Design a protein around this ligand. Structure first.
Ligand SMILES: Cc1cc2c(cc1C)N(C[C@H](O)[C@H](O)[C@H](O)COP(=O)(O)OP(=O)(O)OC[C@H]1O[C@@H](n3cnc4c(N)ncnc43)[C@H](O)[C@@H]1O)c1[nH]c(=O)[nH]c(=O)c1N2
Ligand SMILES: O=c1ccn([C@@H]2O[C@H](COP(=O)(O)OP(=O)(O)O)[C@@H](O)[C@H]2O)c(=O)[nH]1
Ligand SMILES: O=c1ccn([C@@H]2O[C@H](COP(=O)(O)OP(=O)(O)O)[C@@H](O)[C@H]2O)c(=O)[nH]1
Lengths: 510, 86
């Protein structure tokens, strides 16, 4: 029997990856296509929730810094107005020994206690000498750390923090993933700073960035989705894929609709895809991948932004006096992420956990904090007490004063948080992805292709754009297979308007 | 007597031996000195030959920093010959 619908290229999922695919498919305007999503609102893990009190929370707080001009082009098309964006400078610190060490930590030893400083430089010297002679390569993420920073920093920050976020020991992870993620410290630069007491916080793709004025990052992906022809979309319960028949190239949707395809671009989690295919081999294969779940906690507090907080952006917490690994002053990103000062809200509780002095609706202004906590079979979290442990954690780290007035809470558990860069990961992926490609299925995205190196909105979006370009023009998928390549260059060649469109336009005016 | 010996540099009294007391120098000078020691230490880890001149020895063991700030000028001032000739 024939499918209810037939198209050349079918995109599953409307997060950044999928929309990337849809944008390029829309630009080329050649083969027929369709994008579906089980959610009425596109954006996936890049979406935004709002509390009953009017606070916005990303999925951990998201940040736009682009390696691609194509990515930029599409954002400027969705949000063309100027007052649609704010530009920020990256103010990032690490919490250590009661200090706010400027990021990257390994580059600002100066702020630590003198006692600790000595232990870090000692380690760094032992490594710089051993690295002067090394000929082999690091096997684990742990070996990589010890070699690039020394034991001083490893025990002080790297080891404890990484477990805290990955929910697995540094010894169980690979190291080919950390190109532009972890800074390798230069002895000359580290000591120079310790001597001058200066700071080095320019490092990284994060230095400067922009944030959407309204709707958080979620509003971006809504704006983008609006540029696509509606007739080619299915968002909501009518767009969930419940079965994938790779053998006869059909997909079955939640309401029973079937779609035939020639090429399939899938952005759903590859472990879910295996299930929906009912393929025993792929299931056993995907079950060798590892992932951590992420608890996002949102806290809205009353008052004008404290001076202790200032223009800070996101913070790191390697110490065990709080459950979360990262915190974001989400209210500094936009004046529309929290209620306006005039809005009246009762105090739900004080930061220390006790009842407020007054429960009457008072005015603002307000600010917001967003926290992330990791969870895995190696690092369990109690779902009934986590919110309380975070708030307390906030006090322990001098983020909030015990007497601070909390006006709103938020808590959500995302089962698939991070795709874990385990030692076994590439062993499994190098099987799965080619096996899926041989069925004409491009599985791409954070959990589509499972590579954290290149998980991230701009990267994921591009993974999509490239999967289409590979399917239609034979383009090599650079972002997928060569993360270091795309990350250390300016990717300017592909644009939202290429020659193919320019020529086709003049040929019509001709 | 105990040896109380300093080197006069940049209007400071740097305790002898100079190359062990970079602490007392101005911060800007300290930077040049440590950078040299690091580049020198990193080459020392790998050397298998022996220095020819006195100058090659000073660069290998203290770096360009200390070499240019103290050693080179001083050693001429006392030996009345360039380090390169010793
Ligand atoms: C905690 C944390 C923090 C960060 C970020 C994420 C996370 C979780 N990100 C990365 C980012 O969120 C990510 O790259 C994109 O969301 C990935 O897009 P995907 O489409 O691949 O996945 P994602 O999961 O987001 O989207 C896929 C979609 O597919 C749909 N779907 C699933 N199954 C389906 C089915 N069966 N049928 C139909 N639809 C289905 C989902 O409903 C959804 O709409 C990020 N990015 C950034 O650049 N800055 C940052 O700060 C960070 N940091
Ligand atoms: O001060 C720091 C903080 C971060 N990291 C490393 O950077 C990685 C990713 O940090 P980032 O916040 O950029 O990752 P994200 O979760 O936002 O994708 C972490 O796993 C750490 O190993 C680091 O080297 N120094
Ligand atoms: O702070 C110092 C002082 C001395 N010198 C070196 O030590 C050598 C001998 O100095 P010393 O005063 O011991 O010589 P003396 O004149 O007493 O025999 C000199 O040539 C310098 O090269 C040095 O390395 N650092």
């Amino acid at each position: 029997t024939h499918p209810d619908i037939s198209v050349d290229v079918l995109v599953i999922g409307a997060g950044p990856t999928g929309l990337g695919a849809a944008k390029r498919l829309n630009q080329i305007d050649g083969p027929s296509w369709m994008i579906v999503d089980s959610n009425e609102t596109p954006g996936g893990l890049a979406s935004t929730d709002v509390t009953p009190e009017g606070f916005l929370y990303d999925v951990g707080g998201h940040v736009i810094f682009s390696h691609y001009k194509y990515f930029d082009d599409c954002l400027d098309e969705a949000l063309p107005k100027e007052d649609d964006w704010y530009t920020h400078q990256r103010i990032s610190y690490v919490r250590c020994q009661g200090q706010w060490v400027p990021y990257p930590f390994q580059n600002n030893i100066s702020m630590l206690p003198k006692e600790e400083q000595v232990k870090c430089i000692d380690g760094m010297i032992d490594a710089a000498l051993e690295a002067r002679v090394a000929n082999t390569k690091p096997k684990t993420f742990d070996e990589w750390i010890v070699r690039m920073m020394g034991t001083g920093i490893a025990d002080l920050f790297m080891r404890p923090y990484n477990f805290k976020v990955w929910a697995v020991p540094t010894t169980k992870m690979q190291c080919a993933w950390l190109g532009e993620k972890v800074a390798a410290p230069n002895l000359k630069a580290v000591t120079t700073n310790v001597i001058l007491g200066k700071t080095a916080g320019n490092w990284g793709p994060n230095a400067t960035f922009r944030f959407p004025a309204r709707g958080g990052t979620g509003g971006i992906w809504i704006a983008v989705a609006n540029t696509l022809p509606k007739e080619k979309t299915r968002f909501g319960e009518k767009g969930k894929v419940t079965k994938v028949n790779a053998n006869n190239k059909t997909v079955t949707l939640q309401d029973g609709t079937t779609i035939g395809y020639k090429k399939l671009v899938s952005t759903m989690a590859v472990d879910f895809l295996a299930e929906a295919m009912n393929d025993q081999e792929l299931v056993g294969l995907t079950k060798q991948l590892f992932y951590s779940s992420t608890h996002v906690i949102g806290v809205g507090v009353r008052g004008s932004r404290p001076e202790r907080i200032g223009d800070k952006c996101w913070l790191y917490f390697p110490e065990d006096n709080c459950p979360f690994y990262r915190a974001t002053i989400f209210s500094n990103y936009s004046p529309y992420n929290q209620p306006e000062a005039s809005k009246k809200l009762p105090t739900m509780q004080l930061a220390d956990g006790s009842r407020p002095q007054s429960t009457e609706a008072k005015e603002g202004p307000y600010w917001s904090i967003m926290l992330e906590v990791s969870e895995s079979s190696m690092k369990p979290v109690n779902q009934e007490t986590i919110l309380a442990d975070c708030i307390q954690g906030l006090v322990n780290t001098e983020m909030l004063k015990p007497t601070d007035e909390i006006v709103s809470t938020y808590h959500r558990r995302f089962d698939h948080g991070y795709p874990t860069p385990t030692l076994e990961r590439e062993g499994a992926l190098t099987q799965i992805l080619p096996k899926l490609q041989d069925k004409d299925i491009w599985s791409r995205g954070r959990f589509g292709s499972w590579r954290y190196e290149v998980g991230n909105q701009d990267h994921s979006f591009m993974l999509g754009v490239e999967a289409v370009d590979n399917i239609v023009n034979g383009a090599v998928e650079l972002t997928l297979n060569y993360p270091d390549f795309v990350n250390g260059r300016q990717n300017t060649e592909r644009r939202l308007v290429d020659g193919a469109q320019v020529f086709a336009k003049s040929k019509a005016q001709l």
